[PDB]
Paper text:
The TRIM-NHL protein Meiotic P26 (Mei-P26) acts as a regulator of cell fate in Drosophila. Its activity is critical for ovarian germline stem cell maintenance, differentiation of oocytes, and spermatogenesis. Mei-P26 functions as a post-transcriptional regulator of gene expression; however, the molecular details of how its NHL domain selectively recognizes and regulates its mRNA targets have remained elusive. The TRIM-NHL protein family shares a common architecture that comprises an N-terminal tripartite motif (TRIM, consisting of a RING domain, one or two B-Box type zinc fingers and a coiled-coil domain) followed by a C-terminal NCL-1, HT2A, and LIN-41 (NHL) domain.
Residue numbers in the entry: 931 to 1203
Write the structure that this text describes.
């Protein structure tokens, strides 16, 4: 496996600016800021790629505009708005914030149990995948349910999702693979398997269209790189350092790999050797 080096490791357990408490999700921003859903502190934290905090937003609570254990975050490429999913009254809740972090609106998602994966398409549609009843939902910026399709026959437990142009690649945490769907919802094929991609919890798609699938089975961060059609190209690991368990996977334009060490309350930015 090709080694990965630590380019930046930032965060520690706490409440202070730049600290985390069990962060469950992250994304990249319009300017590829590292944007973290700092779950147990009820806030979003926005960083540059060397871990410098730009700003944070979020007050703990269940009022509209407040955050309550936010676990997933995405940014709308065309206007910088944040899409944040947390726990509302009883069930999951989706809220839209401005690029300043100001509450704009709540999107009713009573048809979703758990948001296990969150992404935004090129056209500006919000994609949320449910892990309990495996289902994909495509949602407009103004809250319209544009499309949904059932994937329970083809998936066990979704854990992340990525989109390239118009197909959906869904991480199957308990299926040990990625499931590929069209925008139609028509299933196409799977990428990976239990040998290489064990308990995958992160996926992103390189510019070239390759599929990067992250896992931390051996308590070290491992990445498998597949072609768009499912041919294993390479594997990556951090052999010279003992990386913790991680979740999520995003590729920066430089080719750096970003993941979240949820159980150790920090972000990792990695480069290939």
């Amino acid at each position: 496996a090709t080694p990965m080096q630590i380019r930046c490791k930032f965060g520690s357990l706490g409440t202070a600016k730049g600290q985390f408490n069990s962060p469950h999700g992250f994304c990249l921003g319009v300017d590829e800021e590292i944007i973290v859903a700092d779950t147990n502190n009820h806030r979003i934290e926005v960083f540059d790629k060397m871990g410098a905090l730009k700003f944070q937003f979020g007050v703990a609570g269940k009022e509209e505009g407040q955050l309550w254990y936010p676990r997933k975050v995405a940014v709308m490429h065309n206007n910088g708005k944040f899409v944040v999913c947390d726990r509302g009254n009883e069930r999951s809740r989706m809220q839209i914030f401005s690029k300043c972090g100001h509450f704009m609106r709540k999107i009713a998602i009573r048809y979703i149990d758990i948001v296990a994966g969150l992404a935004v398409t090129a056209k500006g549609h919000i994609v949320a995948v449910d892990s309990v009843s495996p289902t994909v939902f495509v949602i407009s910026e103004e809250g319209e349910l544009v499309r949904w399709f059932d994937c329970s026959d083809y998936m066990r437990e979704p854990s992340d999702i990525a989109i390239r142009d118009n197909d959906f690649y869904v991480c199957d945490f308990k299926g040990h693979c990625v499931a590929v769907f069209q925008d139609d919802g028509t299933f196409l094929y799977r990428i990976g398997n239990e040998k290489v991609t064990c308990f995958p919890n992160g996926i992103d798609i390189s510019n070239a269209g390759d599929v990067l699938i992250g896992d931390s089975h051996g308590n070290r961060f491992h990445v498998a790189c597949y072609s768009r059609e499912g041919a294993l190209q390479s594997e990556f690991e951090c052999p010279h350092v003992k990386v913790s368990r991680c979740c999520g996977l995003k590729i920066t334009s430089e080719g750096y790999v970003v993941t979240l060490a949820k159980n150790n309350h920090h972000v990792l930015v990695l480069n290939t050797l």
